[PDB]
């Protein structure tokens, strides 16, 4: 009843890579945009602020955002 969200550039990239039927890594900064069904099985590398982190997309992911899967904070221990 209101649109979900995804970055334009991201959307059309996924369009092209879907049509040409190859699995290529996608470096993206959109830490907001939702994972819509038509991207599943792709590998997307999301910006953690320094590095891109490769994530494999799955059936489960859909309905969340991208940034849930790239932890921004480096913490192990006191």
């Amino acid at each position: 009843k209101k649109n979900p969200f995804v970055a334009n550039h991201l959307l059309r990239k996924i369009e092209k890579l879907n049509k040409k039927a190859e699995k290529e890594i996608i470096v993206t900064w959109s830490r907001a945009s939702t994972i819509i069904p038509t991207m599943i099985g792709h590998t997307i590398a999301i910006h953690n602020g320094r590095e891109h982190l490769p994530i494999y997309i799955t059936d489960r992911m859909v309905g969340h955002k991208l940034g849930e899967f790239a932890p921004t904070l480096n913490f192990r221990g006191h």
């Binding site: 649109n3 979900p4 069904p37 599943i40 059936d59 489960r60 992911m61 859909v62 309905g63």
Partner: peptide
């Protein structure tokens, strides 16, 4: 099912 769950909201 999270794909169809997503399509029931939007479609």
């Amino acid at each position: 099912d999270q794909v169809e769950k997503f399509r029931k909201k939007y479609g």
